[PDB]
Structures are given as C-alpha cells and as structure tokens.
Design a protein around this nucleic acid. Structure first.
Ligand SMILES: NCCSC[C@H]1O[C@@H](n2cnc3c(N)ncnc32)[C@H](O)[C@@H]1O
Length: 393
DNA sequence: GTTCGATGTC
DNA sequence: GACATCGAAC
C-alpha cells in the first residue's frame, strides 16, 4: 500500500505544528509523511513513526521509530500533529474479512475504542486513537475511506469527532490506483467545533480544495454534498421512510439451511431472487442467480412479507435508486423490502416510475457521490415522495 | 433481525 | 468499465 505523492503533498499542505512540536506518523513503514512534512517545514520538530512490522519500519536517523501496534500503544507524551494513511479493513474471519488477529486482540481493540460499533474498521480505530493522542489544539490529517461520512457503523465516530474538536473533510474519490475505495482527507483539530465540507479539483500542480458547505453546529450527523436543488426536492414531499417500513431480505445462510430450499430447479420450485433479478421497473422471475430454489408458498416462513406483493429497492447497484413492484411475491435473498405503514395510500406504478426517474438518480448521486457501492437505508428513508405517489392518512 | 466491503469477478 | 457481493459480524 502506498499513498500517491500528490495526496501526500495535499495532506502536508493542511498540516501544521509549532516549532519543536511532536509530529507522529502512525503505521509509518518508511515514513513518507514524516519525510514530506520535514521537506516542507524543516527539521525543528520531534519526528516519530509507529509501525507494527519490523520488516516495514525503515525511518531515517532523524526520526524515532517504535515497533508497536499503534492501536494499543501508550506513549509518555501527547502529540502536536499526527498525519498519515492508516490501514483500512474489517477485522474478522479470513474467509470473509481481510484483517486477521486473535480474538483476544480484537477484544483489546473493542475495550480501547469508545467508537467501535458493529463490525467496524481499522481506519475508525486509527482515527479514534489518533484523536486521543493529540494535545489540546493538536492537528490530525489522515486519508481514509469516505464510508464513515454516511454509514451507521461510524455513527459513534462522527459523534466523537463532533464533540472532540473541529473537522474539515475534503473529498478525493477513487485516487488510489488499483484500489477500489473512494477516499477523503480529514483535517481534525482538537479545539473548537463544527464541520467544513470541501470538494477538490486535481491538476498537474496537485489538489486544490473548494469549499462546499459549512455546518458550524455539527453533532455527528451523516455528511452529504447538499445543494439548493437537493434541499428543494427534500422539502417537496414526505420522506419515503415515513410511508414505508423498510426491511431487508433474509440472508443467504437462512435460506441455505431451510428444509424447503433446494440447490436444483424442480416442480413447484421458484428461484430465490437476488439483486441480479431486480431491474428498473421489473423483476426477472425466471433466471437463477443464487443457486437456490424453493416453493413460493413457503417463502413466508423466512419473512412474513414474502407472501405480500410489495415494493423492492436495490442495495448493491451503486449509489442509484433501482425499484420494482414484486407483483408475484417471491422469496428474495437480497434488497430492501418496503411495506406501507398504516393509512398509507400508494400508486405503485407511479411511485416506481418516480423512484427510477433521472431526477432521483441525480439526487442521490449529488448527495452521496461514490462514498459506498450502495444505496443504504439511511439514504433510502430520506428519498422524497410527494402525496401524489404516496400519501399518509 | 441487517450490515459492510485498500470490495469480487466478469 | 458492468454489475453486483454474501455471509461473518453484531
Ligand atoms: N501507511 C501505509 C498504509 S497502512 C500499512 C502499514 O501499516 C502497518 N500497520 C498495520 N497495522 C498496524 C498497526 N496496528 N500498528 C502499526 N502499524 C500497522 C503495516 O505493517 C504497513 O506497514
């Protein structure tokens, strides 16, 4: 893993430390951020790098190198500036997740980090740890995935940043060659409050920040790229989540162990549907993408709502809104399943048309860009629906 | 119950 | 780029 030099340069441009200040690069390897900071600001700082792998630690003699797990490291003194690119990844079983440690080590991380939630991620733990290691008024500059802007797993992290200091977020996007990740830079200072959101433009000269919006009273809410138009559309109708209960499909292991489920087609059996069966405005009931089949009538044993025709919205087609009415009421292995709340009247056909409309695709692309390869529940529940498509009694 | 991906594989 | 994970995680 390397950080492109124009990304390093941009981050160094955002970094500051007082003369003689302590400057730290977590997960440093050969210390590219220490080196770049020194080149730009000179030698009158105490440079420290922390690296877990002895094969990777390779700092110049002007820096102190410590062999340690940064996440469990307890230095004698706090830092003025912490900068770098922390490891990204979920800690879990190797068949499914990339970061592999003893359960005991994962337990130490959970104990250490107040922001740890759900499956979480090393990059969230690195951010929390770094903030904890800052002196009052100290500065952190990290490049990390954009996913914490919007995802529930990072709610405690966002709330923590919001209360611990002031935050600037600079959208970069997919700037790591051969890595599929949309990135942001966070500049956090352990004083003051509020959020500033910035776009960037890349030129030969490097990255230039462009101020997008300011939220001086940010308390850790989801971060979005709002515009006059997104606001105007959001007040035009009721949030979709006010009209529907939003549920998810039963998961693959639930179907795989169910006695009614088969691995081959046969009389009275239908495919268990996936996102590949869902298209804008229609459902493919014939093709099998899950490897699983079952009697339609037994689908309700997995989720009661599989018995009832209802609206289905895609989760893993990227940041877009893809919807269809499941008229037949089939078993699904994937996607959101929307059930009208009490007193809600709908025009399924018109609502589906609206959800699939170009206006709606632009809306979610503006707000959430490419932070995650999904439409998530928190995005979906806020989609505006005017009373002509769906209206609450 | 439902979340997430330095995504996985074409 | 198309077209989406799918199951261990809680
Ligand atoms: N800063 C470059 C991306 S992160 C990759 C580097 O972080 C190191 N690393 C991974 N986990 C670490 C941890 N918990 N503490 C310190 N270094 C770590 C790796 O050994 C590798 O050199």
């Amino acid at each position: 893993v390397e950080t492109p030099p124009e990304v390093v340069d941009f981050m160094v441009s955002l970094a500051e430390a007082p003369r003689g200040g302590r400057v730290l690069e977590p997960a440093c390897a050969h210390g590219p951020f220490l080196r770049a900071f020194r080149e730009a600001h000179g030698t009158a700082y105490r440079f420290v790098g922390v690296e877990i792998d002895p094969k990777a630690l390779d700092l110049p003699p002007w820096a102190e190198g410590i062999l340690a797990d940064f996440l469990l490291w307890e230095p004698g003194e706090a830092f003025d500036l912490i900068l770098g690119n922390p490891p990204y990844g979920i800690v879990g079983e190797a068949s499914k997740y990339p970061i592999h440690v003893f359960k005991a080590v994962k337990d130490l991380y959970k104990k250490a980090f107040s922001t740890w939630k759900g499956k979480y991620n090393l990059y969230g733990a690195f951010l929390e740890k770094a903030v904890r290691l800052l002196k009052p008024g100290g500065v952190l500059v990290f490049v990390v995935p954009a996913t914490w802007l919007v995802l529930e797993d990072f709610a405690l992290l966002r709330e923590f940043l919001a209360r611990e200091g002031k935050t600037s977020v600079y959208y970069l996007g997919e700037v790591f060659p051969q890595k599929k990740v949309s990135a942001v830079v966070i500049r956090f200072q352990k004083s003051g409050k509020g959020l500033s959101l910035w776009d960037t433009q890349e030129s030969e000269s490097g990255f230039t920040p462009i101020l997008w919006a300011e939220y001086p009273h940010w308390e850790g809410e989801i971060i979005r790229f709002e515009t006059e138009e997104t606001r105007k559309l959001e007040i035009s109708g009721m949030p979709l989540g006010d009209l529907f209960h939003i549920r998810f499909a039963a998961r693959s292991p639930e179907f795989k162990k169910h006695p009614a489920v088969r691995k081959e087609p046969g009389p009275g059996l239908v495919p268990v549907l996936t996102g590949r069966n869902l298209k804008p405005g229609w459902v493919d009931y014939e093709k099998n993408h899950s490897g699983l089949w079952m009697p339609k009538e037994r689908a309700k044993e997995l989720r009661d709502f599989y018995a009832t025709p209802h609206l289905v919205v895609a989760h893993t087609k990227g940041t877009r809104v893809v919807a269809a009415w499941d008229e037949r009421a089939y078993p699904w292995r994937e996607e959101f399943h929307l059930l009208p709340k009490e007193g809600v009247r709908l025009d399924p056909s018109s609502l589906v048309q609206w959800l699939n409309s170009e206006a709606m695709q632009k809306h979610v692309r503006t707000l959430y860009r490419d932070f995650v390869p999904h439409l998530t529940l928190r995005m979906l529940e806020r989609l505006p629906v005017r009373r002509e498509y769906g209206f609450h009694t």
